[PDB]
Design an enzyme around this catalytic site. Structure first.
Site, mmCIF file in Angstrom:
data_model
loop_
_atom_site.group_PDB
_atom_site.id
_atom_site.type_symbol
_atom_site.label_atom_id
_atom_site.label_comp_id
_atom_site.label_asym_id
_atom_site.label_seq_id
_atom_site.Cartn_x
_atom_site.Cartn_y
_atom_site.Cartn_z
ATOM 1 N N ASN A 39 0.859 -1.202 0.117
ATOM 2 C CA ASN A 39 0.134 -0.071 0.092
ATOM 3 C C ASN A 39 0.798 1.149 0.042
ATOM 4 O O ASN A 39 1.880 1.214 0.669
ATOM 5 C CB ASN A 39 -0.904 -0.092 1.293
ATOM 6 C CG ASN A 39 -2.059 -1.035 1.205
ATOM 7 O OD1 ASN A 39 -2.902 -0.904 0.456
ATOM 8 N ND2 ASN A 39 -2.029 -2.150 1.713
ATOM 9 N N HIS A 47 0.252 12.032 -10.343
ATOM 10 C CA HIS A 47 -0.923 11.564 -10.376
ATOM 11 C C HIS A 47 -1.000 10.298 -9.447
ATOM 12 O O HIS A 47 -1.638 10.082 -8.613
ATOM 13 C CB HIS A 47 -1.275 11.212 -11.900
ATOM 14 C CG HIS A 47 -2.652 10.611 -11.814
ATOM 15 N ND1 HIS A 47 -3.896 11.106 -12.322
ATOM 16 C CD2 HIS A 47 -2.832 9.079 -11.805
ATOM 17 C CE1 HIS A 47 -4.758 10.291 -12.393
ATOM 18 N NE2 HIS A 47 -4.203 8.943 -12.270
ATOM 19 N N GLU A 48 0.255 9.558 -9.441
ATOM 20 C CA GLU A 48 0.415 8.152 -8.955
ATOM 21 C C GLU A 48 0.407 8.562 -7.310
ATOM 22 O O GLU A 48 -0.282 8.024 -6.343
ATOM 23 C CB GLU A 48 1.592 7.483 -9.465
ATOM 24 C CG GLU A 48 1.372 7.033 -10.696
ATOM 25 C CD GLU A 48 -0.146 6.530 -11.085
ATOM 26 O OE1 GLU A 48 -0.556 5.395 -10.160
ATOM 27 O OE2 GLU A 48 -0.638 6.761 -11.883
ATOM 28 N N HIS A 70 -2.515 9.248 -5.841
ATOM 29 C CA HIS A 70 -3.147 7.770 -5.338
ATOM 30 C C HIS A 70 -2.406 7.217 -4.015
ATOM 31 O O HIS A 70 -3.272 6.863 -2.976
ATOM 32 C CB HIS A 70 -2.992 6.624 -6.470
ATOM 33 C CG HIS A 70 -3.717 6.840 -7.493
ATOM 34 N ND1 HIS A 70 -5.136 6.817 -7.422
ATOM 35 C CD2 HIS A 70 -3.477 6.826 -8.926
ATOM 36 C CE1 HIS A 70 -5.832 7.240 -8.481
ATOM 37 N NE2 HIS A 70 -4.775 7.116 -9.461
ATOM 38 N N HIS A 115 -9.711 8.604 -8.841
ATOM 39 C CA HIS A 115 -10.040 9.285 -9.971
ATOM 40 C C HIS A 115 -10.948 10.529 -9.838
ATOM 41 O O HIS A 115 -12.070 10.064 -9.187
ATOM 42 C CB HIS A 115 -10.255 8.466 -11.234
ATOM 43 C CG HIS A 115 -9.009 7.593 -11.505
ATOM 44 N ND1 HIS A 115 -9.232 6.313 -12.139
ATOM 45 C CD2 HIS A 115 -7.741 7.743 -11.731
ATOM 46 C CE1 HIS A 115 -7.888 5.739 -12.176
ATOM 47 N NE2 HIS A 115 -6.902 6.735 -12.167
HETATM 48 C C1 LIG Z 1 -6.224 2.237 -7.559
HETATM 49 O O1 LIG Z 1 -6.408 3.327 -8.247
HETATM 50 C C2 LIG Z 1 -6.234 3.145 -9.677
HETATM 51 C C3 LIG Z 1 -7.371 2.830 -10.567
HETATM 52 C C4 LIG Z 1 -6.897 2.506 -11.733
HETATM 53 C C5 LIG Z 1 -5.410 2.530 -12.284
HETATM 54 S S1 LIG Z 1 -4.818 1.774 -13.634
HETATM 55 O O2 LIG Z 1 -3.490 1.565 -13.820
HETATM 56 O O3 LIG Z 1 -5.763 0.736 -14.081
HETATM 57 N N1 LIG Z 1 -5.258 2.961 -14.948
HETATM 58 C C6 LIG Z 1 -6.462 3.186 -15.690
HETATM 59 C C7 LIG Z 1 -6.572 3.962 -16.632
HETATM 60 C C8 LIG Z 1 -6.457 3.255 -17.998
HETATM 61 C C9 LIG Z 1 -7.992 4.592 -16.663
HETATM 62 C C10 LIG Z 1 -5.817 5.141 -16.783
HETATM 63 N N2 LIG Z 1 -4.453 4.733 -16.390
HETATM 64 S S2 LIG Z 1 -2.866 5.541 -17.130
HETATM 65 O O4 LIG Z 1 -1.718 4.542 -16.707
HETATM 66 O O5 LIG Z 1 -3.172 5.504 -18.467
HETATM 67 C C11 LIG Z 1 -2.777 7.115 -16.212
HETATM 68 C C12 LIG Z 1 -1.633 7.167 -15.650
HETATM 69 C C13 LIG Z 1 -1.273 8.879 -15.005
HETATM 70 C C14 LIG Z 1 -2.076 9.808 -15.428
HETATM 71 O O6 LIG Z 1 -1.645 10.994 -15.053
HETATM 72 C C15 LIG Z 1 -2.150 12.021 -15.582
HETATM 73 C C16 LIG Z 1 -3.375 9.577 -16.235
HETATM 74 C C17 LIG Z 1 -3.655 8.399 -16.615
HETATM 75 C C18 LIG Z 1 -4.586 4.382 -14.992
HETATM 76 C C19 LIG Z 1 -4.444 5.035 -13.878
HETATM 77 O O7 LIG Z 1 -5.259 5.663 -13.283
HETATM 78 N N3 LIG Z 1 -3.234 5.059 -13.333
HETATM 79 O O8 LIG Z 1 -3.150 5.676 -11.828
HETATM 80 C C20 LIG Z 1 -4.505 2.698 -11.423
HETATM 81 C C21 LIG Z 1 -4.844 3.161 -9.891
HETATM 82 CA CA LIG Z 2 4.398 0.707 0.884
HETATM 83 ZN ZN LIG Z 3 -4.636 6.884 -11.722
#
Ligand SMILES: COc1ccc(S(=O)(=O)N2CC(C)(C)CN(S(=O)(=O)c3ccc(OC)cc3)C2C(=O)NO)cc1
Ligand SMILES: [Ca+2]
Ligand SMILES: [Zn+2]
Ligand SMILES: [Ca+2]
Ligand SMILES: [Ca+2]
Ligand SMILES: [Ca+2]
Ligand SMILES: [Ca+2]
Ligand SMILES: [Ca+2]
Ligand SMILES: [Zn+2]
Ligand SMILES: [Zn+2]
Ligand SMILES: [Zn+2]
EC number: 3.4.24.17
Lengths: 169, 173
Positions: free
Chosen positions: B93, B119-120, B123, B129
């Site tokens: 976590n 963004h990460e 989280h 989101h």
């Molecule tokens: C637990 O909370 C989360 C929920 C979904 C994802 S995910 O890895 O499934 N992915 C879902 C989605 C495909 C909708 C968008 N991308 S991403 O890699 O393309 C993304 C990464 C960074 C960003 O920064 C602006 C925007 C999109 C993410 C995500 O949400 N990561 O967190 C990650 C964390």
């Molecule tokens: Ca940890």
């Molecule tokens: Zn995300």
């Protein structure tokens, strides 16, 4: 020397390698050299050649991991299992993983990356452990004279040549 | 503004972070710098502070991965999922994983490491989101050919402050 059961070996002469990630312990360039020399030591005693990929699946994928990574044999923390590799084959085979819980070094003041990498690539090429104490494939790997007086033993040479032969050219 | 199911938070005000491994895409101190700046983003708007560990278990373990890498969710490859982080808590976590099958960059030519990392670590600090399209926590990696002037949106700030609150030394409008 020892060769795995049903002597699994690569069918081709040229093999590609890819360094998937890097350890925080050493400068990126030191890692490249350790690997280049590790591959060089087997390359000069057999008709095998190597080239480097930066994307896609290479035959020999090389990475640094801690505990559970992407396989069924997680690492064990500092010491003991230092690294492990897979015998010839597609996919996960040929790949070599290094334990980052170890302190990878350029010299013999931690776990020398060169000595261990050469040994692991051994596994990736088809070699199992040797009973000869002076052989690279003896599971002591980093416990050697290092490349000031390091030299593949004739046991290692015999073992790899039983699989791929001596250098033609 | 949207938070995690259960609404986890960190009880400690100071968090530790560690760069477990490095990407072949960029030189080392470049990765480090994109991470410091991604942490600064959240520090400026909350009383949260961060420190870097070079060994041992830090709250936020940061690493670069490919396909199956030891957790519940394998990375797909050169596209789609770029990275994923875990909600606040022990163990895996609060950690952040970056799909190395992507070309991480210091600018907008591939996948900007700073942008995604901010963004990460959202989280990793408890934000989910968002619905707002102008918010960092909206799951859309933008094709903006402008990034020189970055700012956390008001709803990002509204989200992170409801979990930790405003900085003690900042005057309020
Ligand atoms: C637990 O909370 C989360 C929920 C979904 C994802 S995910 O890895 O499934 N992915 C879902 C989605 C495909 C909708 C968008 N991308 S991403 O890699 O393309 C993304 C990464 C960074 C960003 O920064 C602006 C925007 C999109 C993410 C995500 O949400 N990561 O967190 C990650 C964390
Ligand atoms: Ca940890
Ligand atoms: Zn995300
Ligand atoms: Ca392979
Ligand atoms: Ca170990
Ligand atoms: Ca290490
Ligand atoms: Ca991907
Ligand atoms: Ca990459
Ligand atoms: Zn492994
Ligand atoms: Zn071995
Ligand atoms: Zn992951």
């Amino acid at each position: 020397f020892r060769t795995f059961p049903g002597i699994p070996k690569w069918r081709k002469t040229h093999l590609t390698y890819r360094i998937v990630n890097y350890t925080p312990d050493l400068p990126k360039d030191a890692v490249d050299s350790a690997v280049e020399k590790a591959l060089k030591v087997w390359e000069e005693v057999t008709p095998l050649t190597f080239s480097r990929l930066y994307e896609g699946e290479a035959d020999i994928m090389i990475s640094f991991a801690v505990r559970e990574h992407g396989d069924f044999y997680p690492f064990d923390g500092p010491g003991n299992v230092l690294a492990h590799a897979y015998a010839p084959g597609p996919g996960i085979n040929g790949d070599a993983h290094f334990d980052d819980d170890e302190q990878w070094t350029k010299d013999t003041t931690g776990t020398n990356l060169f000595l261990v990498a050469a040994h692991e690539i051994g596994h990736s090429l088809g070699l199992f452990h040797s009973a000869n104490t002076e052989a690279l494939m003896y599971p002591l790997y980093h416990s050697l004279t290092d490349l000031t007086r390091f030299r593949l033993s004739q046991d290692d040479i015999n073992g790899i040549q039983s699989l791929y032969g001596p250098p033609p050219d």
